[PDB]
Amino acid sequence: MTEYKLVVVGAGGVGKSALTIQLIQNHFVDEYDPTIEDSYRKQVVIDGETCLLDILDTAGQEEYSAMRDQYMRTGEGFLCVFAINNTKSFEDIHQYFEQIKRVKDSDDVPMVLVGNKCDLAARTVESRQAQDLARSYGIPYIETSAKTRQGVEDAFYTLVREIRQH
């Protein structure tokens, strides 16, 4: 079956793992559990087609630079996550965009900008700010909550559709 190599990137703590675990394992549990590198392979049906989602869940940790270069090189589409209550994480996300472009020598890589934790009240990043940034890379902006599952399938399936019709 067709395989989609998805990579979830972003600053530490923004909810990369929570989003992936919500998608694959249908749940959220609030816990501290930083990631090194975790792979999830799940066979799903998206718009009538059987496909294999090969999702690499990456570390926010800035020390794994070499590891970041290799998974950007081999990844097909990128979920670029920040948290809407963490301005720094949003400032950092454009750095991820530029690294993806440099390593893949393309400004045509399928990507989705994900503003996560949209269930929390203390929002510090306005949606308009994130839409602007997304527009300037030609990519969609989708807000998510790994806790309530809001937007989660939207974000991941939109990325698959961005690949599908590249």
Ligand SMILES: Nc1nc2c(ncn2[C@@H]2O[C@H](COP(=O)(O)OP(=O)(O)NP(=O)(O)O)[C@@H](O)[C@H]2O)c(=O)[nH]1
């Ligand atoms: N309210 C709320 N909390 C969330 C959400 N997503 C994640 N969290 C919480 O925020 C923390 C960070 O989540 P986590 O998924 O581990 O982030 P990460 O980006 O994978 N971290 P790392 O880069 O270290 O692997 C955890 O306490 C988690 O429960 C969300 O959508 N809403």
Ligand SMILES: [Ca+2]
């Ligand atoms: Ca559930």
Ligand SMILES: [Mg+2]
């Ligand atoms: Mg993680």
Ligand SMILES: [Mg+2]
């Ligand atoms: Mg290059």
